[PDB]
């Protein structure tokens, strides 16, 4: 139900450390015993970038603010390449969203 | 004897105005320059080869 890619069931690495956390005091303290932290790669990051990308499309189409950046060491062709690779990266987090096709049960037939 | 004098004529020049130019500023200028030309600035080239 916690949705995960079907083609990485090995989806976890793990680490267990004996030393408990410290709180930096600045309030009442919880009496902590054990804690958890986590790093996760996901396609929700595509949901984040979907706007920041269209914001670069709107800004750059209107050429808004581009004379501050250019004046201070840049050329418009650099704003194009950056966005072009960010359009490749848009397809990259969609390719890791592909429910992949089955390969089982394909054969050549017999030579005579 | 004819008795003396008894005749004058009036010291009189009528008044008029000539070459009084209507030089008021009421239509004093005619010159113009447009407030710039029409241009497009809102669109990207999208030149991804």
From Swiss-Prot, chain A:
Residues the record marks as site: Involved in polymerization: 112
Highest taxon of source: Eukaryota
Modified residues (3'-nitrotyrosine): 112
5-glutamyl polyglutamate PTM sites in chain numbering: 104, 106
Covalent link Glycyl lysine isopeptide (Lys-Gly) (interchain with G-Cter in ubiquitin), residues: 31
Family designation: Belongs to the tubulin family.
Subunit structure: Heterodimer of alpha- and beta-tubulin. A typical microtubule is a hollow water-filled tube with an outer diameter of 25 nm and an inner diameter of 15 nM. Alpha-beta heterodimers associate head-to-tail to form protofilaments running lengthwise along the microtubule wall with the beta-tubulin subunit facing the microtubule plus end conferring a structural polarity. Microtubules usually have 13 protofilaments but different protofilament numbers can be found in some organisms and specialized cells.
Function in brief: Tubulin is the major constituent of microtubules, protein filaments consisting of alpha- and beta-tubulin heterodimers. Microtubules grow by the addition of GTP-tubulin dimers to the microtubule end, where a stabilizing cap forms. Below the cap, tubulin dimers are in GDP-bound state, owing to GTPase activity of alpha-tubulin.
Protein name: Tubulin alpha-1B chain
UniProtKB/Swiss-Prot annotation, chain B:
Phosphoserine PTM sites in chain numbering: 7, 26
Compartments, as annotated in UniProt: Cytoplasm, Cytosol; Cell membrane; Cytoplasm, Cytoskeleton; Cell projection, Axon
Site (Not glycated): 13, 19, 23, 33, 42, 45
Tissue specificity as recorded in UniProt: Expressed in neurons. Isoform PNS-tau is expressed in the peripheral nervous system while the others are expressed in the central nervous system.
Linked residues for Glycyl lysine isopeptide (Lys-Gly) (interchain with G-Cter in ubiquitin): 13, 19, 23, 33, 45, 49
Record note on what altering residue 3 to S does: In FTD1 and CBD; reduction in the ability to promote microtubule assembly
Subunit structure: Interacts with MARK1, MARK2, MARK3 and MARK4. Interacts with PSMC2 through SQSTM1. Interacts with SQSTM1 when polyubiquitinated. Interacts with FKBP4. Binds to CSNK1D. Interacts with SGK1. Interacts with PIN1. Interacts with LRRK2. Interacts with LRP1, leading to endocytosis; this interaction is reduced in the presence of LRPAP1/RAP.
Disease entry from the Swiss-Prot or TrEMBL record: In Alzheimer disease, the neuronal cytoskeleton in the brain is progressively disrupted and replaced by tangles of paired helical filaments (PHF) and straight filaments, mainly composed of hyperphosphorylated forms of TAU (PHF-TAU or AD P-TAU). O-GlcNAcylation is greatly reduced in Alzheimer disease brain cerebral cortex leading to an increase in TAU/MAPT phosphorylations. Frontotemporal dementia 1: A form of dementia characterized by pathologic finding of frontotemporal lobar degeneration, presenile dementia with behavioral changes, deterioration of cognitive capacities and loss of memory. In some cases, parkinsonian symptoms are prominent. Neuropathological changes include frontotemporal atrophy often associated with atrophy of the basal ganglia, substantia nigra, amygdala. In most cases, protein tau deposits are found in glial cells and/or neurons.
The protein's name: Microtubule-associated protein tau
Species of the source: Homo sapiens (Human)
Gene of this entry: MAPT
